[PDB]
Amino acid sequence: MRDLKGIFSALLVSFNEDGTINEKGLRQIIRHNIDKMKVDGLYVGGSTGENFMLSTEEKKEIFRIAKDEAKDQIALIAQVGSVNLKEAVELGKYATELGYDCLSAVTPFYYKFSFPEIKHYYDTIIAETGSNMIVYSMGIEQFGELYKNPKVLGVKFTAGDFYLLERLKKAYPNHLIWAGFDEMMLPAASLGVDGAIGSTFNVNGVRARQIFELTKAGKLKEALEIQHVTNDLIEGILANGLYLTIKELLKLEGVDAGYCREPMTSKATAEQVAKAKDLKAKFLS
Amino acid sequence: MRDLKGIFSALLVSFNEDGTINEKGLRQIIRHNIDKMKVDGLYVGGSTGENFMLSTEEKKEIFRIAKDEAKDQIALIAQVGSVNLKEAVELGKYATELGYDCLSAVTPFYYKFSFPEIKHYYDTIIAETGSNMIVYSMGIEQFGELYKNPKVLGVKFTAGDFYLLERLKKAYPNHLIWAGFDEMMLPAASLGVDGAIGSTFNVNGVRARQIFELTKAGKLKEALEIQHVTNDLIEGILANGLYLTIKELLKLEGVDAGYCREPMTSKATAEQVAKAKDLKAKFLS
Amino acid sequence: MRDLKGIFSALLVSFNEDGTINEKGLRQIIRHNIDKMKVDGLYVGGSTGENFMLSTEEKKEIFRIAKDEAKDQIALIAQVGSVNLKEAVELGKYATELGYDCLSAVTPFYYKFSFPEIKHYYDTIIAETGSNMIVYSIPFLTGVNMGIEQFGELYKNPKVLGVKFTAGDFYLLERLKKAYPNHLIWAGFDEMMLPAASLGVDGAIGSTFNVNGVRARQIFELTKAGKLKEALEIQHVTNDLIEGILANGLYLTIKELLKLEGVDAGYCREPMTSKATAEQVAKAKDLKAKFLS
């Protein structure tokens, strides 16, 4: 398998006003990431792609478009998790067929699964597809149990618990860790994470790569200055509405990022558009 | 519309070992509710029916079977909510076509929706189907906003907040409230709820109806004795595994309740089956 | 033993502007509760009395004043719980010496105590004083949620009589009456009195009974008689009052309502905001006009 370390943008999807996928806009988002953000890879079908508001067929169309547009230029991970395990297996087979480099899967949600149920879910996706898997996160003993399956590569770490982060890095040194919190990239990199998967790399890739590299070189003061500017931008993005603000910033860079998908507010208000313009002037110009 | 007050069993579904719907077993569960539990209605496609682990087509098949088997014998409510609003509209149209008496819809989950997004979700399902709606639950001001749509009938109240319960009953006296916590039926009925939707009525209907009726007549000590026995049974059901224990209790009554659907543990262990047998002997024989 | 069932006001305390106790005002609050609110007893030294912001000597002074003013006319429970167990024993001995009918103690807080430590705390207060105990449960402030098995362990001590259930979990409330039918439960959420009375609580201990004790007794007694429609009507009016009290500021509003009836309920103690704003006073006068006139 392809090297999966480094910076991965969690891929946003362009939607039309009626909720359907805007394919031309989706390819422009992808091209922006590969060609201008210079990411190491794309993480497709995650929360950032508005995945859980879509049908199985719509998820497959996004997987097809992303792989067709990215070809073998960068690494591609397909998030195929769901509350429906049969759907996760169907999506995992499809992504595997398309040539995705590995699968990822959120823990089954809506109902409360026990750990045994969560491990059986991941083992089932792996057994039925033949593909390697990135888990989400549970404690050290439970990661150990997950890691008894040799096709589990590591975890997309999205909880800000740096004690567990250190414990995992020590206990399972040959397993990978990708940071999921872009605003805490520096402290995660100080503990040796192997990469980061994030929604803000769709527009702030340049700084994200600088933080990651400066931190691994021990240049912590310089990395912190760039994390500070990054977090001023992230703070404004969160206050204005995360998904809509990143799309509006992409629109100012000539990327047809389109609308959000309903039940999320689909169209940005004038105020939201105004705030996006100010953010672009201050942090991305 | 049909009277929707009273006792509604949240319908469990019978699955085969491979996860597919066992239609004969599903009809036996339905017949048990109508003919022996003597419920006022069935609440189909909710959490209890393992709905969120299923495909759109599987949800439609369950709606078809339940309406075919129940005909017009009792009231039928169809839960059609989802994170995918287009799926909720598709399911709401189908249930409306089949003749369901009203729709219900969980608040969109997985992502964090704002109140405006939640209200637009409910208004969209109503506008696209033409059917009345039962919401889930937010505070008094937000229920008021939901209740500006005249086709919203009331709420399936699943949070144990009896202060909000009283406030809602006072503020919106012509809207209905169904209790969602079977173990707190007495206190809910003391505040005048119009009915209850619950998973334990699939086997404990008799006592549920007695509690509801004794409480409305002011016979609180007698209602409490029956709530105590009910809660001894519920306590054992929860400890042993809710969905699997109710199915195992149904099996002891000659109802082919089958397996649970994966990612939930599909098969009951011997210990779980043993505990179910003890529960049946102590509380349902 | 002196009956501890029924309607108990959680005694409010009158403070001077500098934070010291206003004894004359405290006595007026006590008299208002006994003579006008017609309470069965007073719960003294609880959260409502602003207890946790005071010194040990101030807590002793409030115990002394309350017992000297109430004398033997009503039942009196003394809340003596603290994070300092030595203080709790000192206060429990003092309240016992004064003649309080029973002690009560909040679960030790701040630190995350184990169940054996909580049980040892209760057992120590009882052993050192010789007095009976009511467990004071208030999860919203403490963060401590004890289950049914744990109450069982506390109840192995025969001097633990029951619990002040300042919580809204009515599944746990029912489980308690099922498991330990001979043990007492006092409801702590005034806005949920009807549903708690439907489950057989033996009484209620509340801050709003300092001004709304007439309606509170009615809800309790009507619910016990099975007159739910009548009880719910009075619970509805009561909760319109409580909703306004909570939005305007609980402590300061109840004290301003008492002031309007001629009770010198004084200031609140710092670090709480000690004086109401003009807007808070105006809203309290409207609540009095609408609900207590």
Place this chain on the structure above:
Amino acid sequence: MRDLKGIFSALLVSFNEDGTINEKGLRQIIRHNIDKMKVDGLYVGGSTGENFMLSTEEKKEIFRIAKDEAKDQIALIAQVGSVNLKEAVELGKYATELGYDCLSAVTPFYYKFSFPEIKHYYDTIIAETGSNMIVYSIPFLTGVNMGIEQFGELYKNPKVLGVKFTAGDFYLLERLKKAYPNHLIWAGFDEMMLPAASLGVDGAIGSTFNVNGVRARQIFELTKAGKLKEALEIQHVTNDLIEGILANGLYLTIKELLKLEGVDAGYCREPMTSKATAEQVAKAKDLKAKFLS
């Protein structure tokens, strides 16, 4: 002013079996921290010192003993926060009179205080004592989570120097250094020292530095030098020790580790479990063998 940056142990206190202070043992703990742990200073009267279970006079006694033993050899911060603001002012005046370099105070807890009330509490302690203040933030115990704007308001008082960040939110930690670059931050989670040092904290205040202060200084200094691999190795060994300490019982295990080095760290104070079990003692000896020998 006396430099307050660097490595501070959160002073543990030695108690006798009956709960009274063991002055000789307390002095031995102080000496161990200064002479062996090589700390920059001591944080006295915090959660680790079992402060919240003590009387006001006991807290004063610990302040007196710690200052008499440490004298002027190291920096000394006095935590004087309480739910009773009058007590906090009394303790702050006493610690100021003794010569403590700075005061610190936990956010008022138990009751749900408003932000204006919290700010008034800090402003009152400062005004009545004339001493500088460190805000003590410990959300896991208090339930109080202040945001960036609120820290801004507290920092309008020039005598508020910074915050003891006993929390793991590193987004908020970064936002604090961005907004208020001239204000100090001390990390409070010993197991997360490396990532906090990566974000520029000015020091650390920790309970485990009573026994692991040599490694704690190394992690801090190596991270500041950008030697991440070396720092992470020492953080890894440190966290194996901390993981065992937490599983065996934090307070009793650190006291037993101190006892094995000849420091009479004594018992814990009730309502905490005062004595370790045989199994706890045996596990503490193994932790000493593996990590502190």
